[PDB]
């Protein structure tokens, strides 16, 4: 009865999608597809994160306006997401008019509720560029440990936090020039007004993964502070109402893009839904954000406080994932492991990576390692050599000898029913984001199917007097077992699933449809459904990434 709204983190419009970021997008897409295959009403949206100084820097580097820069990168991101089967219902932009309006609405409601303060602050200013400098565009000497080259917010060597004005001998990263100190009025969101609210919110059952417990404990012990939400002109972003020449910091309007992408989606595709159905405080529907562990603070503290302050509902849960390593090391251009999503697609089948990720993904916030030799072996053994070969080895006889038509009865009803009944556990694993468990359970079923075929030996039956019906019965069971496997893998391998729908002539492929055992059922001529992963193609991708 409850409908679900799901998002992925919004990528910045300042560069391409890389293979490491695909982990969370593929995780979310698998979940959405599996939940839909189980009959849930799931809406799935994303958008480009379009604002901020970093995006202005890229635009100028590329000789174009910010508006043309974000238009270019949005098309690139959509291209890459689509290439990996990450299919959103809608892909928008934080620059949209819908997001401008909702940003103003949330700000003004918070301002009138008492959650906004304005005050003059001392800020570093680049005199060459005529720009006030935010913390990530200032470097200097940490006042505590005296280490060079630290940004304006905190030191990586000793961990001290500070205002950028406490750095010794600072520099602007925009020009290298020495900044000067000036005054600028800044707008602050009064996050401390929500300390007790968030201490309860972050600990509600299902809101956050259990591992984030200690990380939040640190955060609440350290104490919440007013959040600086304004940026001075020049800034590519939304102007703050009644604050001339002041803009919302990109992170204010970025999560609002979740609302606005959804809002623009339902305006064309779900006339049965309205915005309040998901975002009014009395909503009975669910909202989930898939996000990396590096942005949990924005999503677990800033975001629900801003929503609560504006009388909107808050996310039901944050699904948090770790990072991807490659061959047991951080991804580097020098090792050719900082791989653009576009480069992978120029050399390899995307469903290789969907499967490999699924076989390792769990509900835990952990880093996943992509060992490239293991990637080749795992995908080839599991999919090409085991799962797809079950169809091949059974279809061989049905296509060649039995007019492409499965037997009129199921000769192993209990065995097939046992594969059907295993769907309940597989569905529960997908829903719990325990993808590695779902894959293991499916592969255990594939082993049982090969065990059955090996026991019956259709190749021997085809060479024995009078066993024609038994060859057909056995191969028909094998195809039915394969069909169950492909239904269960469909959230992970949607293209393979479409191909199996064509091969088995099946219009429906959701979980309910699997209860229909195929009998007297014409199938198409079998053709290979997946090529093996070629190690040279993997190496060509690595070499193209150096």
Binding site for ligand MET (CB under 6 A): 9-12, 49, 254-255, 295
Compute the least distance from the CB of residue 322 to Na ion, in Å: 6
**456 φ, ψ (degrees, to nearest 5):** -80, -25
Nearer to ligand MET, 66 or 255 (CB): 255
Q: Is 247 left (phi over 0), alpha (psi -120 to 50) or beta?
A: beta
**Least distance (Å) from Na ion to the CB of residue 268?**
33
Neighbours of 137 (CB within 10 A): 23
**Quick one: what does residue 49 bind among ligand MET, Zn ion, Na ion, none, with the CB cut-off 5 to 8 Å set by partner type?**
ligand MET
Length of the chain, in residues = 546
Burial of 328 (0-12, 13-18, 19+ CB in 10 A): exposed
| 158 in a labelled binding site | yes
Three-state SS at 329: strand
Write down the least CB distance from residue 361 to ligand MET, Å: 20
Residue 357 CA to residue 72 CA, distance in Å, equals 29
- CA atoms of 23 and 293, how far apart (whole Å): 12
Q: Is 134 in the site for Na ion (CB under 5 A)?
A: no
- Rule CB under 5 A: is residue 145 a binding residue for Zn ion? yes
Cis peptide before 354 (omega within 30 of 0): no
Q: Cβ of residue 143: shortest distance to Zn ion, in angstroms?
A: 8
12 binds, among ligand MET, Na ion, Zn ion, none (CB under 5 to 8 A by kind): ligand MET
Q: Which stretch binds Na ion (CB under 5 A): 48-56, 184-192, 314-322, 516-524?
A: 314-322
Instruction: Give the residue nearest to ligand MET (CB).
Output: 49
Q: Of these partners, Na ion, Zn ion, ligand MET, none, which one is at the site of residue 199 (CB under 5 to 8 Å by kind)?
A: none
Closest distance to ligand MET from the beta carbon of 304 (Å): 13
Residue 133 touching Zn ion (CB under 5 A): no
Counting Cα atoms < 13 Å in the Cβ hemisphere of 374 gives: 12
Contacts of 42 (CB under 8 A, 6+ apart): 3, 4, 5, 6, 32, 35, 36
52 binds, among ligand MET, Zn ion, Na ion, none (CB under 5 to 8 A by kind): none
Minimal distance, residue 98 CB to ligand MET, in Å: 15
Which residues fall within 8 angstroms of residue 79, CB to CB, at 6 or more apart?
Answer: 342
Q: Which is nearer to Na ion, 14 or 321 (CB)?
A: 321
**Among candidate residues 19, 167, 135, 37, the one with its CA nearest the CA of residue 544:** 19
Rounded Cα gap, residues 94 and 79, in angstroms: 18
Instruction: Work out whether 437 is an interface residue with Na ion (CB under 5 A).
Output: no
Cβ closest to ligand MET, residue 34 vs residue 295: 295
- The reply to whether 8 sits near Na ion by the rule CB under 5 A is no
The answer to the question of whether 155 is labelled as a binding residue is: yes
Nearer residue to Na ion within complex by CB, 230 or 321: 321
The DSSP line for 456-470 is H-HHHHTTSTT-HHH
Partner in contact with 145, chosen from Na ion, Zn ion, ligand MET, none, beta carbon below 5 to 8 Å by kind? Zn ion
x/- mask, Zn ion, residues 159-178, rule CB under 5 A, reads -x------------------
Minimum CB–partner distance for residue 354 and Na ion (Å): 15
* Residue 142 assigned to a binding site: yes
Q: How many alpha carbons lie under 13 Å from residue 485 in its C-beta half-sphere?
A: 27
CB of 139 to Zn ion, least distance (A): 13
Nearer to Zn ion, 143 or 336 (CB): 143
User: How many residues line the site for Zn ion (CB under 5 A)?
Assistant: 8
Q: Does 321 bind Na ion (CB under 5 A)?
A: yes
- Pick between residue 117 and residue 145 the one whose CB is nearest to Zn ion: 145
**Are 163 and 170 within 8 A, CB to CB?**
no
Q: Does 436 bind Na ion (CB under 5 A)?
A: no
Report which secondary-structure segment, H or E, holds 8. Answer: strand 4-8
Choose the stretch contacting Na ion; rule: CB under 5 A; options: 48-56, 302-310, 320-328, 337-345.
Answer: 320-328
For residue 495, the partner it binds in ligand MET, Zn ion, Na ion, none, with Cβ less than 5 to 8 A by kind, is none
Residue 261: CB minimum distance to ligand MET, A: 10
Extract the runs of DSSP E, i.e. beta strands, from 37-192. Answer: 42-48, 90-93, 116-126, 131-132, 138-141, 150-151, 168-172, 180-189
Q: Are 299 and 289 in contact (CB under 8 A)?
A: yes
Rounded Cα–Cα distance for residues 526 and 502 (Å): 10
- Residue 543 CB partners (closer than 8 Å, separation 6+): 336
Q: Which residues are annotated as a binding site for ATP?
A: 333
Q: Which residues are annotated as a binding site?
A: 142, 145, 155, 158, 333
Q: Which residues bind Na ion (CB under 5 A)?
A: 321
Q: Which residues are annotated as a binding site for Zn(2+)?
A: 142, 145, 155, 158
Q: Which residues bind Zn ion (CB under 5 A)?
A: 142, 144-145, 147, 155, 157-158, 160
């Amino acid at each position: 009865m409850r409908k679900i709204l799901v998002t992925n983190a919004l990528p910045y419009a300042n560069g391409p999608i890389h293979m490491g970021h695909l982990l969370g997008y593929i995780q979310a897409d698998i979940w959405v597809r599996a939940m839909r295959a189980m009959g849930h009403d799931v809406t799935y949206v994303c958008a480009d994160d379009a604002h901020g100084t970093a995006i202005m820097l890229r635009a100028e580097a590329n000789g174009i306006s910010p508006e043309e820069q974000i238009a270019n990168v949005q098309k690139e991101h959509i291209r890459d997401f689509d290439g990996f089967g990450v299919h959103f219902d809608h892909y928008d932009s934080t620059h949209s008019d819908a997001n401008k309006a909702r940003s103003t609405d949330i700000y003004i409601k918070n301002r009138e509720a008492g959650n906004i303060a304005v005050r003059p602050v001392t800020q570093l200013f680049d005199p060459e560029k005529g720009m006030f400098l935010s913390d990530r565009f200032i470097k200097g000497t940490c006042p505590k440990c005296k280490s060079e080259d630290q940004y304006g917010d905190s030191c990586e060597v000793c961990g001290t936090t500070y205002n950028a004005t406490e750095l010794l001998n600072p520099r602007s990263t925009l020009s290298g020039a020495t900044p000067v100190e000036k005054s600028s009025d800044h707008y602050f969101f009064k996050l401390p007004n929500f300390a007790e609210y968030l201490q309860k919110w972050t600990r509600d059952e299902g809101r956050l993964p259990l591992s984030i417990a200690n990380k939040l404990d640190e955060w609440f012990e350290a104490g919440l502070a007013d959040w600086d939400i304004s940026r001075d002109a020049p800034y590519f972003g939304f102007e703050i109402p009644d604050a001339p020449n002041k803009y919302f910091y990109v992170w204010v309007d970025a999560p609002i893009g979740y609302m606005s992408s959804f809002e623009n989606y339902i305006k064309t595709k779900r006339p049965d839904l309205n915005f309040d159905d998901f975002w009014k405080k009395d909503s009975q529907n669910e909202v989930y954000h898939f996000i990396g562990k590096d942005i949990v603070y924005f999503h677990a503290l800033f975001w629900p406080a801003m929503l609560e302050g504006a009388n909107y509902r808050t996310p039901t849960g944050l699904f948090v994932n770790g990072f991807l390593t490659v061959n047991g090391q951080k991804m580097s251009k020098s090792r050719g492991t900082f791989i653009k999503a576009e480069t992978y697609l120029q050399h390899l089948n995307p469903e290789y990576l969907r499967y490999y990720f699924a076989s390792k993904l769990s509900d835990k916030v952990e880093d996943s390692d992509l060992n490239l030799d293991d990637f080749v072996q795992k995908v080839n053994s599991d999919l090409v050599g085991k799962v797809v070969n079950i169809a091949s080895r059974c279809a061989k006889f049905i296509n060649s000898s039995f007019n492409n038509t499965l037997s009129s009865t199921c000769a192993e009803s209990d065995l097939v029913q046992s594969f059907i009944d295993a769907g309940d556990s597989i569905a529960a694993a997908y829903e719990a984001r325990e993808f590695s468990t779902a894959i293991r359970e499916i592969m255990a079923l594939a082993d049982r199917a090969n065990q059955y075929i090996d026991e019956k030996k259709p190749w021997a039956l085809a060479k024995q007097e009078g066993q024609e019906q038994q060859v057909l019965d056995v191969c028909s069971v094998g195809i039915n077992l394969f069909r169950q496997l492909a239904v269960y893998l469909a959230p992970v391998l949607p293209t393979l699933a479409q191909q199996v729908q064509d091969f088995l002539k099946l219009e429906s492929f959701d979980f309910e449809s699997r209860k229909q055992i195929l009998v007297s059922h014409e199938i198409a001529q079998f053709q290979p459904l997946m090529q093996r992963v070629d190690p040279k193609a993997v190496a060509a991708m690595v070499d193209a990434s150096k």
